[PDB]
Design an enzyme around this catalytic site. Structure first.
Site, mmCIF file in Angstrom:
data_model
loop_
_atom_site.group_PDB
_atom_site.id
_atom_site.type_symbol
_atom_site.label_atom_id
_atom_site.label_comp_id
_atom_site.label_asym_id
_atom_site.label_seq_id
_atom_site.Cartn_x
_atom_site.Cartn_y
_atom_site.Cartn_z
ATOM 1 N N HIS A 83 0.705 -1.097 -0.006
ATOM 2 C CA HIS A 83 -0.100 0.012 -0.327
ATOM 3 C C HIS A 83 0.199 1.052 -0.615
ATOM 4 O O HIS A 83 0.426 2.383 -0.297
ATOM 5 C CB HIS A 83 -1.161 0.000 1.401
ATOM 6 C CG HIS A 83 -1.480 -1.367 1.509
ATOM 7 N ND1 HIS A 83 -2.955 -1.686 0.791
ATOM 8 C CD2 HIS A 83 -1.487 -2.566 2.048
ATOM 9 C CE1 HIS A 83 -2.870 -2.714 0.537
ATOM 10 N NE2 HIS A 83 -2.047 -3.401 2.056
ATOM 11 N N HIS A 118 2.167 9.226 1.154
ATOM 12 C CA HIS A 118 0.976 8.374 0.256
ATOM 13 C C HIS A 118 0.600 10.126 -1.209
ATOM 14 O O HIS A 118 1.552 10.656 -1.009
ATOM 15 C CB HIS A 118 -0.223 8.739 1.071
ATOM 16 C CG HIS A 118 -0.375 8.178 1.582
ATOM 17 N ND1 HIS A 118 -1.461 7.128 2.106
ATOM 18 C CD2 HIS A 118 -0.535 8.137 3.281
ATOM 19 C CE1 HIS A 118 -0.960 6.688 2.942
ATOM 20 N NE2 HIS A 118 -0.594 7.870 3.791
ATOM 21 N N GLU A 152 -3.539 13.529 1.441
ATOM 22 C CA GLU A 152 -4.291 12.837 2.095
ATOM 23 C C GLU A 152 -4.951 13.571 2.440
ATOM 24 O O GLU A 152 -6.088 14.115 2.120
ATOM 25 C CB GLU A 152 -4.062 11.447 2.870
ATOM 26 C CG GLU A 152 -3.049 10.579 2.011
ATOM 27 C CD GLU A 152 -3.997 9.137 3.395
ATOM 28 O OE1 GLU A 152 -3.341 9.335 4.698
ATOM 29 O OE2 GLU A 152 -4.090 8.288 2.368
HETATM 30 N N1 LIG Z 1 -2.355 -5.569 16.607
HETATM 31 S S1 LIG Z 1 -2.437 -4.070 15.227
HETATM 32 O O1 LIG Z 1 -2.085 -5.268 13.844
HETATM 33 O O2 LIG Z 1 -3.686 -3.340 14.975
HETATM 34 C C1 LIG Z 1 -0.709 -3.350 15.018
HETATM 35 C C2 LIG Z 1 -1.352 -2.017 13.413
HETATM 36 C C3 LIG Z 1 0.067 -1.037 13.850
HETATM 37 C C4 LIG Z 1 -0.242 -0.173 12.175
HETATM 38 B B1 LIG Z 1 -1.789 -0.271 11.106
HETATM 39 B B2 LIG Z 1 0.135 -1.214 10.627
HETATM 40 B B3 LIG Z 1 1.205 -0.094 11.359
HETATM 41 B B4 LIG Z 1 0.736 1.204 12.280
HETATM 42 B B5 LIG Z 1 -1.330 1.040 12.438
HETATM 43 B B6 LIG Z 1 -1.609 1.399 9.758
HETATM 44 B B7 LIG Z 1 -0.582 -0.136 9.722
HETATM 45 B B8 LIG Z 1 0.775 -0.035 9.732
HETATM 46 B B9 LIG Z 1 1.629 1.578 10.401
HETATM 47 B B10 LIG Z 1 -0.149 2.019 10.446
HETATM 48 C C5 LIG Z 1 -0.569 1.635 10.226
HETATM 49 C C6 LIG Z 1 -0.368 2.445 8.343
HETATM 50 C C7 LIG Z 1 -0.767 3.919 8.399
HETATM 51 C C8 LIG Z 1 -2.055 4.301 8.420
HETATM 52 S S2 LIG Z 1 -1.843 6.452 8.482
HETATM 53 N N2 LIG Z 1 -1.712 6.052 6.941
HETATM 54 O O3 LIG Z 1 -2.617 6.860 9.172
HETATM 55 O O4 LIG Z 1 -0.275 6.483 9.252
HETATM 56 ZN ZN LIG Z 2 -0.564 6.961 6.089
#
Ligand SMILES: [N]S(=O)(=O)[C][C][C]C1234B567B189B21%10B32%11B543B645B786B917B%1021B3%114C6571[C][C][C]S([N])(=O)=O
Ligand SMILES: [Zn+2]
Length: 257
Positions: free
Chosen positions: A61, A93, A103
């Protein structure tokens, strides 16, 4: 499997993640005339001198640079935040052309791209626990416009050919995220959500007013990435942004007059 296309993009996400239609979704349009200056907001404290980058990853993504978050080495504090938030990763993004990709928008203006530095609140111990809390994450958002090159981005751009397709990763040590920051830390803030699934309503957004400039050559390298895995039909990783969502009952606050 969610994505950004016609059949799996943002308009579809609510089916697997019904919080997509919730009360504190992100991103939003920042109407600069309506945001209220809040003299009680603190300067943001960005302490990145001991940051330890680990890997760079195409996650299907975006691409992300991941940090060691097992100690307080690269932390965000102050501003609208209570307590200490550890840097986990940054990612971007971007658009197919320079007139879209961000965004957040500012008075409906779209930037060419947006950098997100994702941090989690140490009081919850790990990021998985933090995403279940209304004050679990703090994401620092920085707009990118196209003009002059950003020297501190070049180390990133130069390894993108090695992570072209989903699931590829590479060593990415000794990267200094201070090289991605604008001069000013003046910001807007509001309570919101992750902008990708699971769309959890766990984020204090801190969006910097001052964009960084990147070159056309730098952003063109972002656009050579692929959403697809190796061997699958090639689909450029472009337009990986969620559109602005309804503000509903929220106030955007400005740190500056
Ligand atoms: N236990 S869990 O899998 O819910 C932890 C998720 C951690 C994430 B998720 B992954 B890790 B952390 B959270 B979202 B996706 B990756 B990072 B943020 C993510 C991607 C960016 C979201 S944004 N665009 O709002 O910054
Ligand atoms: Zn993001």
């Amino acid at each position: 499997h969610w994505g950004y296309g016609k059949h799996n993009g943002p308009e579809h996400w609510h089916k697997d993640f019904p919080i997509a239609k919730g009360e504190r979704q992100s991103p939003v349009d920042i109407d600069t005339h309506t945001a209220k200056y809040d003299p009680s907001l603190k300067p943001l404290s960005v302490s990145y001198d001991q940051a330890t980058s680990l890997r760079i990853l195409n996650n299907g993504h975006s691409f992300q640079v991941t940090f060691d978050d097992s100690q307080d080495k690269a932390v965000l504090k102050g501003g609208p935040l209570d307590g200490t938030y550890r840097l986990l990763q940054f990612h971007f993004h971007w658009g197919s052309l320079d007139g879209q990709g961000s965004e957040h928008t500012v008075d409906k203006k779209k930037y060419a791209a947006e950098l997100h530095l994702v941090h989690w609140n140490t009081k919850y111990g790990d990021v998985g626990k933090a995403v279940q809390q209304p004050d679990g994450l703090a994401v620092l958002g920085i707009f990118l416009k196209v003009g002059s090159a950003k020297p501190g981005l070049q180390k990133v751009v130069d390894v993108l050919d090695s992570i072209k397709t989903e699931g590829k990763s590479a060593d990415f040590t000794n990267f200094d995220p201070r090289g991605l920051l604008p001069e000013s830390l003046d910001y807007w803030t509001y309570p919101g959500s992750l902008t990708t699934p699971p769309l959890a309503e766990c984020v204090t957004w801190i969006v910097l007013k001052e964009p960084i400039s990147v070159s056309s050559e730098q952003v063109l390298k972002f656009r050579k990435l692929n959403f697809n895995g190796e061997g699958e039909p090639e689909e450029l990783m472009v337009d990986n942004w969620r559109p602005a969502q309804p503000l509903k009952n929220r106030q955007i606050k400005a740190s500056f007059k």
